[PDB]
Design a protein around this nucleic acid. Structure first.
Ligand SMILES: [Mg+2]
Ligand SMILES: [Mg+2]
Lengths: 721, 721
DNA sequence: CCGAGGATGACGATG
DNA sequence: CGCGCATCGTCATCCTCGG
DNA sequence: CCGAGGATGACGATG
DNA sequence: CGCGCATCGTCATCCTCGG
């Protein structure tokens, strides 16, 4: 007397499941088929009797709220339904009815892991009422995030299940030994030997979800309910940094699973989904750019080689395939893509006809920096940024600070949790114009969306709302010619449509008599209509019936502000301004950075001169004096030391006297002493000039050089189609 | 009056196709959707009127010989059928009936490209009789393989459509300028600008296939016919190196498309598919190993980081994903995989239950060299190999030469063209035993297949034929317990089967009453049978009915011999012997390599001694003598120079006197002169000892150290399950 | 054939 | 060589009902 | 349910 | 996060027919 489930091959079934003992049987759900091996490995240790396992594809269907048809057709929740047993329609009191009495989740201990757990809680708490009220039914197997490897001259080997947990052993006892750490960024970086250990224990890897208590049910809704995106916006506002969940508790009330472990993924989801108002980047794109700057992309290389590089040296945690698509995206140049593309698309990078999905394999295509790109991201600014620490490596900045708001240039789209974003691209020219307006305490011009190489029309209806038109023309007796589709309308979308109008449908009658394509480095649909259907078309409208009108809305322009707080901007200029005031402050910062360096060189020179001077008139001798007795005698005479980066140090990482010792015996001449005095008083004049230029003055010098560069950028763009 | 094709969205259709003008219309077929962009780009230049394009997925269905059902269900040849028009059943005389009058192939100009062309010729010449008799119907668009970029101080930019074509400009005029080359290893590394050029020309990119002439029809069959694998074996034997096709011909008789362009892929297909008898590797695996040796894999790194490295520095032309799966394969250790795994599987590398397909993502898993691996591939042998030149870089060797035939250890499988291969794994122990037999002019023992960690039985029936058994046991009243499946029989194969026997089928009645799994670090199916069905089972046999008998055949053990010629070996010892005689010759080579180096050092020392001696008794002075007048005075006195690698040169890349100048003034002492004389006469004794050891003596020393290492290898394997 | 109003899909970084 | 689905938010267009 | 004999699939590096 | 198909050679087992 046992129910055997037979349409699910991947299920390793508990020997006792579906029998009068199913209530003692736990079901282990893993994140994906790869992790399914770890569970099965575990089933060896704990026993195939009261344990079984099944693989969760990946992100699973949020069932609240969702149509019957939707969930019925969803074969994964159907799988967990049939194997657990679970009748859909009634209230739960026992688990005595199901094939398994307990369900346990093996996520791989990252953020998206927690997103999976939550999705499961939602599913269970929605599809079956009384279920999560049954104490001890939902379990969670947890795994280490870091393993430390103690090496000299000893080796106990340890494990850590949180970051702060670990960071603490670090500025605590890390010093006490020799050691090296290892990140467990997903299941299956765990060795077999190790997984067996876990399972041999599992009183310390199992944590239980407490049954539903007051406000549990609410939070699950105030997180997964499709009706509550606005509240999620505040729920995230409210989260107070550092609020994580206890390392050893064994009971985890939902209500701060949600409020202490889901918000962590939710905060993460937004960070990778939404751009910073300052540079227009998302963390992934910002890594790619940094990587290019790190090496010297003045000469091209396959994006397949540039992938592993950016990846390796920015602590990337996703595919190289994932990384490469990001590079490809930065480089695409067809009409409707990048108003300015920072990377050059040398090869098959995708085309307008499909919105760039047609692109070739990373290993056959090449990029380099766009010559103009280093005119937008000025190198002189690089020394100023805060370079993030990640996985104990330093990497790209929080943000870059281009000389114009790139987010306004290129725009951005994104879908996060609670928040969403859309900003259309604008015109680098008008943008610069408003920057000038802000520099002169003047009233700003208004700006409209604008697409590089596009040739249609964009009109404002209400503020924050626009309509974008293509071009349709009559070119003969009942003959029309389309020469422009709205931007981001791909050719093949319009093609499927015309072809349908042509042959007709088993839902619609054909209305196009004949069509032909003649696209050139441009769009060209030539369409013929029966005099009957030409009549119909005027009534319904030519642009309307031919799918050549699309809207552009600025009612959801959101971005992380400079303090890293998500913000909804209510106008285009509200963005431009925020940029301006931060971009202006950093011009001071740069001027000041550059003058501190010149200051250090005048300093350098002054002491070289005094140095020569001393020897010349013979107050200091060098020939035949030991390393120590000579440089310890320089210390006496006040002479500073000098490091690799030019900075002085004046008393007892600090730098050496190699700026004075490195000088030879060609050194001790009137001719050198003069040559020195000369460059010194020129590094003085140099400094005087710099200090005259204000922040707007410097900014402007960059804007001008950009203006030139942007014209050459344009001429190359046009010359390439 | 035009036929419009409407179930194929990807087709950019020639405006005039399907009309009374279809016969003037060419159809452009591309290798894959990515290349489809290039054709469409071309349709802009040549015109949408008489041209169209459709994408070939990849390798297409060879139709000869193939069942109606097979081809009918093949939606790609269905696509080309419907769009060309092509009625299946009758004889062709005109093209006046079809929608296109000419068909043209855009392959990406590599070997597999030509495999596509051939496949198309086969298809056309088989499915439609008179077609390829119509002169000028089959075209071929060709693309450059290399582009040279002339830089200083001038720039005409050139293109090359063959290798030899180019190699010739090289040892010709490459010297004449500054330049850099670029490989076009597939379509879509071509820039847009460039593709437009091609199409603006295309009298010089189009080549025509001459209609079918005598022996054309035969060759197509004597290549693609499933009945002629043996002839293909000879057809490849016959091919005479250097026999390629003319660069400018414009007409390409099939008969040496096949015999001058297909055999090139066929030769290539075999090289990547079949291993070398010497190291057991295929070129891809051999690259991976070299890469590890190149860096120092004594400490682990994610295979995702090791991928781009091996790749980058061995001129790999496939995915990093492709590369990574190869690394994963070298590391897998479950029972039924690698008798010795050269790389360690640290993480989720795949498991027996699925034959390793369950493995995790490259970025979550780690490898390093197996400690034993450098005991099989001795580093001292590295200096001896011929390191292939590829794409003007040097890279891995033709083959490695392990101290035992690794191909016999690990075995190999492969499917090429004409040829195929299967060699089961054998026992490193028995192997060494036969090596000893060959070293002593003794009669060899016979060997049987053998799987690390496997616990079943392998019996010989005929020579070259074996049967492999699992273990089935009766463990109670009508209760059976399976504890071993034949090797390379995966758990889940046996599971699907038992589950079917359990629930039964709509083709078969259930015969298993109950089954349970209890696998531990081992297999354990516990099966219950009705007394009725236990009776039936004895009659049909327990091993037979429970799928626990599988064959092992040695009737197709093929490998590239040492001279790179494919060979079918007729016994296991025929392989072992070939290895032995080459492995023995290279022991001499090594001994000789090592003694030449010692010889050079005795030499070094001798001249240092003479050097000091000269100064000591003062026949040569140094203090205050110019670089030139001092080292030009050493040249006079006979003293040799010395390079980076230790080799002397004695007269007027050659090396410097830094082995004598680098010596200081602590140098000129009795104490140094003694110390020198001492190490010299010890580098002398050192040489004397080495020269005593024969090749078998050295080989044996390695075998012994291996024997120890292999025991530790085993103990770690067992301790990890 | 109408408008209403509910359901559905496209974007892009993730499993 | 190709294809799929899932989250997540917004807004647009498709699709179904009922007059 | 028999054996015959034709069709089908598994392996692994490629499109 | 999942799935598919194609070449290519050999040999094994599945599957269909017809007695
Ligand atoms: Mg993960
Ligand atoms: Mg190719």
């Amino acid at each position: 007397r046992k129910s055997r489930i037979t349409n699910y091959p991947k299920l390793e079934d508990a020997n006792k499941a579906g029998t009068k003992e199913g209530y003692k049987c736990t079901l282990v759900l893993t994140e994906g088929d790869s992790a399914l091996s770890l569970a099965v490995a575990g089933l060896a240790v704990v026993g195939r009797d009261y344990y079984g396992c099944y693989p969760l594809r990946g992100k699973m269907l949020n069932v609240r709220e969702a149509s019957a048809d939707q969930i019925l057709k969803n074969a994964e929740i159907q799988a967990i339904k049939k194997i657990m047993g679970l009748q859909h329609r009634k209230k739960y009191e026992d688990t005595k009815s199901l094939r398994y009495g307990h369900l346990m989740i093996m996520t791989d201990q990252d953020h998206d892991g927690s997103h999976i757990k939550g999705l499961i809680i939602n599913f269970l708490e929605s599809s079956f009422l009384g279920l999560l009220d049954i104490q001890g039914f939902l379990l969670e197997f947890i795994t280490p995030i870091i393993k430390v490897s103690i090496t000299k001259p000893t080796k106990n080997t340890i494990a850590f299940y949180n970051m702060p947990d670990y960071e603490k052993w670090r500025e605590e006892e890390s010093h006490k030994f020799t050691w090296k750490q290892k990140y467990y960024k997903g299941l299956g970086t765990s060795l077999a030997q190790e997984v067996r250990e876990y399972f041999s224990n599992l009183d310390r890897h199992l944590k239980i979800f407490h049954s539903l208590q007051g406000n549990d049910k609410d939070y699950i809704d105030l997180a997964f309910s499709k009706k509550k995106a606005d509240d999620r916006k505040e729920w995230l506002r409210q989260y107070e940094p550092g609020t994580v969940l206890d390392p050893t508790l064994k009971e985890i009330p939902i209500s701060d699973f949600i409020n202490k472990e889901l918000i962590l993924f939710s905060l993460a989801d937004n960070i990778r989904s939404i751009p910073n108002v300052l540079d227009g980047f998302k963390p992934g794109q910002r890594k790619v750019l940094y990587g290019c700057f790190k090496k010297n992309l003045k000469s091209e290389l396959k994006v397949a080689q540039l992938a592993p590089y950016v990846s390796e040296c920015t602590a990337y945690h996703h595919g190289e395939q994932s990384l490469a698509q990001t590079i490809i995206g930065l480089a695409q140049n067809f009409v409707g893509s990048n108003n300015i593309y920072l990377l050059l698309p040398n090869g098959a990078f995708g085309t307008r006809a499909t919105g760039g999905k047609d692109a070739a394999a990373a290993r056959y295509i090449y990029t380099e920096l766009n010559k103009l790109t280093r005119k937008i991201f000025h190198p002189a600014d690089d020394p100023l940024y805060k370079y993030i620490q990640e996985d104990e490596k330093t990497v790209e900045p929080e943000w870059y600070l281009p000389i114009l708001p790139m987010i306004l240039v290129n725009g951005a789209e994104g879908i996060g949790t609670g928040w969403s974003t859309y900003i259309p691209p604008f015109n680098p020219l008008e943008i610069i114009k408003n920057i000038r307006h802000l520099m002169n305490d003047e009233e700003l011009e208004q700006m409209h969306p604008w697409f590089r190489g596009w040739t249609g029309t964009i009109e404002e209806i209400e503020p924050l709302r626009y309509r974008m038109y293509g071009r349709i023309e009559q070119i003969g007796d009942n003959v029309l010619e389309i020469t422009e589709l709205p931007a981001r309308t791909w050719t093949s979308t319009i093609k499927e449509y015309l072809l349908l109008g042509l042959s007709g449908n088993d839902k619609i009658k054909p209305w196009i008599k004949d069509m032909e394509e003649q696209h050139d480095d441009n769009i060209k649909f030539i369409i013929t209509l029966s005099p009957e259907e030409m009549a119909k078309t005027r009534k319904i409208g030519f642009y309307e019936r031919f799918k050549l009108i699309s809207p552009i809305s600025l009612m959801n322009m959101v971005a992380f502000d400079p303090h890293g707080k998500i913000k909804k901007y209510n106008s285009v200029n509200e963005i431009l301004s925020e940029f301006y005031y931060v971009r202006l402050e950093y011009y001071q910062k740069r001027k000041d950075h550059m003058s501190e360096r010149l200051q250090w060189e005048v300093e350098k020179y002054s002491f070289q001169v005094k140095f020569i001077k001393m020897i010349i008139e013979k107050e200091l001798t060098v020939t035949n004096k030991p390393r120590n007795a000579i440089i310890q005698e320089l210390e006496n005479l006040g002479f500073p030391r000098f490091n690799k980066e030019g900075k002085p140090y004046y008393g007892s990482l600090y730098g050496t006297y190699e700026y004075l010792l490195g000088m030879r015996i060609w050194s001790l001449t009137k001719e050198r002493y003069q040559k020195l005095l000369k460059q010194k008083q020129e590094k003085e004049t140099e400094l005087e000039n710099l200090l005259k230029l204000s922040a707007k003055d410097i900014w402007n010098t960059d804007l001008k050089a950009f203006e030139v560069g942007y014209q050459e950028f344009l001429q190359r763009d046009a010359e390439a189609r």
